[PDB]
Amino acid sequence: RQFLIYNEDHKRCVDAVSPSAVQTAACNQDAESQKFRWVSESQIMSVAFKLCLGVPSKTDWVAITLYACDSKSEFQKWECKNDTLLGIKGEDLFFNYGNRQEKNIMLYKGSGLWSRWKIYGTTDNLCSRGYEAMYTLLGNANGATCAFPFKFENKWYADCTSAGRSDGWLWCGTTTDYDTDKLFGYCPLKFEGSESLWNKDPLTSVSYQINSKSALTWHQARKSCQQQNAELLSITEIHEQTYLTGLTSSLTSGLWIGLNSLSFNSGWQWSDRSPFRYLNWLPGSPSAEPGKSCVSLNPGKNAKWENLECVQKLGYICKKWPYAGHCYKIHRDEKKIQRDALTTCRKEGGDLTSIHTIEELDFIISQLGYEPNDELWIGLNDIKIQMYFEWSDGTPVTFTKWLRGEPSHENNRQEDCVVMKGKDGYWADRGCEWPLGYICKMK
Ligand SMILES: [Ca+2]
């Protein structure tokens, strides 16, 4: 994530000589004085000096030297324009070198070959290696992001470090002055022992990271799992939900899971695109309140799920007619209830239709004769195991497309069968004792 600043024309890299002298030198990957890194969306810091590149004013031909890193300073913000060009944010003044025998980097109005810089060893501009906020693990910062650079025992560190430790674990300070604030966390990076944070289910080889100490938003939490090559927890099996109930049996604070309702066109879904085929809501949830689109697993309430406003700060859990060999047919003439429609499809040699891909769903709606005012049965049901939807034909449930607000599966309404209704062909659950069309499927 650290880079050298290279000027292709000169064949020279930027070199930090002193906090008040930023110049150039023969490129050297091992010369720490030449290494830099993005520490914010707009700040470029020196790795050797832990100081940020800036200017005294946004005026033509001033000296670019190192400054104390300041997230509020308009004079330390850089941005890429017209690809390689590197200029001060908000002005047509650029990172220049070479004019008028000046060995120091200068902010110049020209946009020639001496104002364009690439990441040494690549053909990309500096912005290609942009800053990625790093959410801490464990620690006492409640999941806050690393702050670079930070001061620890009167030394400045530009990256995660194991200083003050013998176990090689990498950590960082979430504030600039760690020695004073004492707020820290471990870095979401690889290091001998990093897997200690993950619980590996011996049944399915799936890994889970339980971050009960952090306090992040739903969207922040998801990025934490993502930056660890993972995603928010998805629960698609009873034995899975139970396992997490065991791991969190001793906790009490709610934990973000991947269950959200953020696609305003569809219903409940998992952030990792897992099929929403298992329900385990808390009494009173999902609530009728419109702002609550994100779901939390509450280990203090039997590990059941509740939906809350996505900005609430909580802990989180990471996780790490023929078509395609079948023949489909719609029945609208004589309408039947679910169990009767099921018998008919089985007498006709098949079963109630199962849907496993968007391609299969797109086929049913566009070809089989579907009309946007339809409401037809499908094989998705939870008659056998309440709250566990399976396909009537016994095939795996790998796909779900719920209508906005579905599956409601309200407490005492026995909504155990699923129908395909609406203009978009999405699904919904309802009582099984109602006459409706149905869709059969066979080989
Ligand atoms: Ca319903």
Curated annotation (Swiss-Prot):
The positions flagged as glycosylation sites are: N82
Query: What cystine pairs are annotated?
Result: C13-C27, C52-C69, C146-C172, C160-C187, C225-C318, C294-C310, C345-C440, C417-C432
Residue intervals of the Fibronectin type-II domain: 141-189
Q: Which residues form a coiled coil?
A: none
Q: Enumerate the subcellular locations listed in this protein's record, separating them with semicolons.
A: Endosome membrane; Cell membrane
Q: Where in the numbering of this chain does the C-type lectin domain appear?
A: 203-319, 323-441
Ricin B-type lectin domain location: 1-120
Q: What does this protein do?
A: Mediates the endocytosis of glycoproteins by macrophages. Binds both sulfated and non-sulfated polysaccharide chains. (Microbial infection) Acts as a phagocytic receptor for bacteria, fungi and other pathogens.
Notes concerning its domains:
The C-type lectin domains, also called carbohydrate-recognition domains or CRDs, 1-3 have at most very weak affinity for carbohydrates. C-type lectin domain 4 shows the highest affinity binding and has multispecificity for a variety of monosaccharides. At least 3 C-type lectin domains (4, 5, and 7) are required for high affinity binding and endocytosis of multivalent glycoconjugates.
* Oligomer status and interactors: (Microbial infection) Interacts with Dengue virus. (Microbial infection) May act as a receptor for hepatitis B virus, enabling uptake of the virus in hepatic dendritic cells.
- Name listed for the protein in its UniProt record: Macrophage mannose receptor 1
Organism from which the protein derives: Homo sapiens (Human)
What gene name is given for the protein in this entry? MRC1
